[PDB]
Amino acid sequence: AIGPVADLTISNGAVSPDGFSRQAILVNDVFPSPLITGNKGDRFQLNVIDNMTNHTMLKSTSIHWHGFFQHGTNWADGPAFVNQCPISTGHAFLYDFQVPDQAGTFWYHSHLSTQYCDGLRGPIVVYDPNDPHASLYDVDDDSTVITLADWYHLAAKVGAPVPTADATLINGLGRSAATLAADLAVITVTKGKRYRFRLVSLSCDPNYTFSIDGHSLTVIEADSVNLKPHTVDSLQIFAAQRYSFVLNADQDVDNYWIRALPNSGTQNFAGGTNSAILRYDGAAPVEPTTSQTPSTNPLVESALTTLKGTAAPGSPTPGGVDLALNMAFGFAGGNFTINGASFTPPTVPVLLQILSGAQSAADLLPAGSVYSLPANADIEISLPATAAAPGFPHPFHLHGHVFAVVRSAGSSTYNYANPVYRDVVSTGAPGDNVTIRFRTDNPGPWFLHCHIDFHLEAGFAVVMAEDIPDVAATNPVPQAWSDLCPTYDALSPDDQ
Ligand SMILES: *[C@@H]1O[C@H](CO)[C@@H](O[C@@H]2O[C@H](CO)[C@@H](O)[C@H](O)[C@H]2NC(C)=O)[C@H](O)[C@H]1NC(C)=O
Ligand SMILES: *[C@@H]1O[C@H](CO)[C@@H](O[C@@H]2O[C@H](CO)[C@@H](O)[C@H](O)[C@H]2NC(C)=O)[C@H](O)[C@H]1NC(C)=O
Ligand SMILES: [Cu+2]
Ligand SMILES: [Cu+2]
Numbered sequence: 001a002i003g004p005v006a007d008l009t010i011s012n013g014a015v016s017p018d019g020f021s022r023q024a025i026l027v028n029d030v031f032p033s034p035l036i037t038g039n040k041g042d043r044f045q046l047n048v049i050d051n052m053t054n055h056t057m058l059k060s061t062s063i064h065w066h067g068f069f070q071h072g073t074n075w076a077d078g079p080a081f082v083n084q085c086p087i088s089t090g091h092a093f094l095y096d097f098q099v100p101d102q103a104g105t106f107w108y109h110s111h112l113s114t115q116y117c118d119g120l121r122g123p124i125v126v127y128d129p130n131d132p133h134a135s136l137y138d139v140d141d142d143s144t145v146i147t148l149a150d151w152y153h154l155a156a157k158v159g160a161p162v163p164t165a166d167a168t169l170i171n172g173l174g175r176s177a178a179t180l181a182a183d184l185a186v187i188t189v190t191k192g193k194r195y196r197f198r199l200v201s202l203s204c205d206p207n208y209t210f211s212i213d214g215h216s217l218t219v220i221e222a223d224s225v226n227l228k229p230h231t232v233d234s235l236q237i238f239a240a241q242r243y244s245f246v247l248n249a250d251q252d253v254d255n256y257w258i259r260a261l262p263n264s265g266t267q268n269f270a271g272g273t274n275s276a277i278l279r280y281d282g283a284a285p286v287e288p289t290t291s292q293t294p295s296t297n298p299l300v301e302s303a304l305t306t307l308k309g310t311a312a313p314g315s316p317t318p319g320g321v322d323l324a325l326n327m328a329f330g331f332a333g334g335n336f337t338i339n340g341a342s343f344t345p346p347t348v349p350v351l352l353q354i355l356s357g358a359q360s361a362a363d364l365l366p367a368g369s370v371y372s373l374p375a376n377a378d379i380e381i382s383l384p385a386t387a388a389a390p391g392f393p394h395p396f397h398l399h400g401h402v403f404a405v406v407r408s409a410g411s412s413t414y415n416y417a418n419p420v421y422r423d424v425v426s427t428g429a430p431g432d433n434v435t436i437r438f439r440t441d442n443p444g445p446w447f448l449h450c451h452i453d454f455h456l457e458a459g460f461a462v463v464m465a466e467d468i469p470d471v472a473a474t475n476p477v478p479q480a481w482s483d484l485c486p487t488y489d490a491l492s493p494d495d496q
Helices: 350-355 468-474 484-489
Strands: 005-015 022-027 036-039 043-050 063-066 091-098 104-110 121-127 145-151 167-170 186-189 194-201 208-212 217-222 225-232 235-237 242-248 255-262 275-280 323-326 329-332 335-338 370-373 378-384 395-398 403-407 424-426 433-439 444-450 461-466
Touching: 036 043, 043 063, 063 091, 104 194, 104 242, 121 145, 121 194, 145 255, 167 255, 167 275, 194 217, 235 242, 350 444, 350 461, 350 468, 424 433, 444 468, 461 468
Parallel strands: 005 043, 036 121, 145 194, 186 275, 323 378, 370 461
Antiparallel strands: 005 022, 043 091, 063 104, 104 121, 145 167, 194 242, 208 235, 208 255, 217 225, 217 242, 255 275, 329 335, 378 433, 395 424, 395 444, 403 433, 444 461
16 A cells, blocks of 8 residues: 555554554554555665664664565665664665566565564565466455464563563454453455455464365465465464465355464464454444364465476485585574574674675674575575474575475475475474575575574574675665664664
């Protein structure tokens, strides 16, 4: 409903998405943060004006446009101390980038510390005027975007380091244990019409098992990658993932529960918690009383494939690539590690370190957390799950890229011929060996990190420094970006 050229004014104020009032972060004076849209190939110019005054939730900010490749615009990707210094309060900064060759469902969120959990996070749709699935549906608009989010009555830096959510929000509304009369989100459909619902997880932590009573969901897109249509009766969506599914509203006129069960916190639907309402036009303005039927056809990620049936990069055998890396997870001293290193944000953002002459992974800070990748190559990364990294299953997101999921969680098999491609993948439970491949077609430093924000804060990340020698020439930076670090570094700590 706004974009692709827009101001995004960031401020603080009270919100009560589950009927409990608490201070949070507003965007253009609303919560939840507003939907941004554009079309395939568009230039987005999103001017982020930071007017936040609350240091507890951080006055500074930085925005990641989750899923966009940012080729040539690595400085716009958002992660603080990787791609930029934070925007300082009382300042604005223009993210100006293009989205060639992508269309689907995306989202934006703060990418400073655990700030997005305090409410800076909204959906983005990039429509495709030649969407290859356009004839599967009649309606695809602001009212078919569905977000899922975890909500806490204490702010991210006020509660426990890994807190448990008070409420699941669906399109910014939901109930907690003590607010069982709070308003539920309503999604309206007309009998006989087919809907492209674009489901986006804005979660800071839990994964949701999502279903709608009485209805199947025909999944057609995963994390902005078109799929062969695959009908399921439920699906599990991890933090920062997106699915488009077609719902054919061909059931009896009635209200039907939309359910989003989290993997932690309140795990039932008593009093309408973890729920929202699918209402057919003509149905009574009341809660559903429909029952859940057992899911016998859940989404299985290894069963999904791309619309094109694209092979994984490389040759169909383990290590069949230019560079293979294994990420060994651990946890010690209250910090997560990967291959023995815990990511601590460097004072000089990794992009700036490269622009200033750093040449190798050994040169780049933080030491032990940066991996140099060769240019124009195929890469394979395995991320075996382990109980040594508590709070599994951990979803990992690679910035700047889509990847082939050659091996998914809960599967023993490798698929090089036609695996799904996406950009956030669950690394699953101990015994799994989730394995991805991608091509290094995008010079720059890109975060690879766990999208449980509470764990990322705890160091659960590495940086892929891709094609270091070409990073500067590929990503010319605007002078507003070069002015971010001196502005930020001049702040006193209480103004951060
Ligand atoms: C800045 O934001 C923080 C976090 O939202 C607010 O913290 C509240 O602090 C009060 C007073 O101690 C507690 O009773 C609340 O439980 C805290 N809220 C949350 C959501 O954790 C703080 O009040 C905000 N500052 C101002 C001036 O509003
Ligand atoms: C997860 O898969 C990776 C990749 O196949 C495994 O790491 C390989 O392990 C073999 C057997 O030791 C070595 O010969 C290769 O050098 C390893 N490759 C890399 C890139 O390190 C890893 O052992 C698997 N982990 C689990 C738990 O199955
Ligand atoms: Cu993200
Ligand atoms: Cu990230």
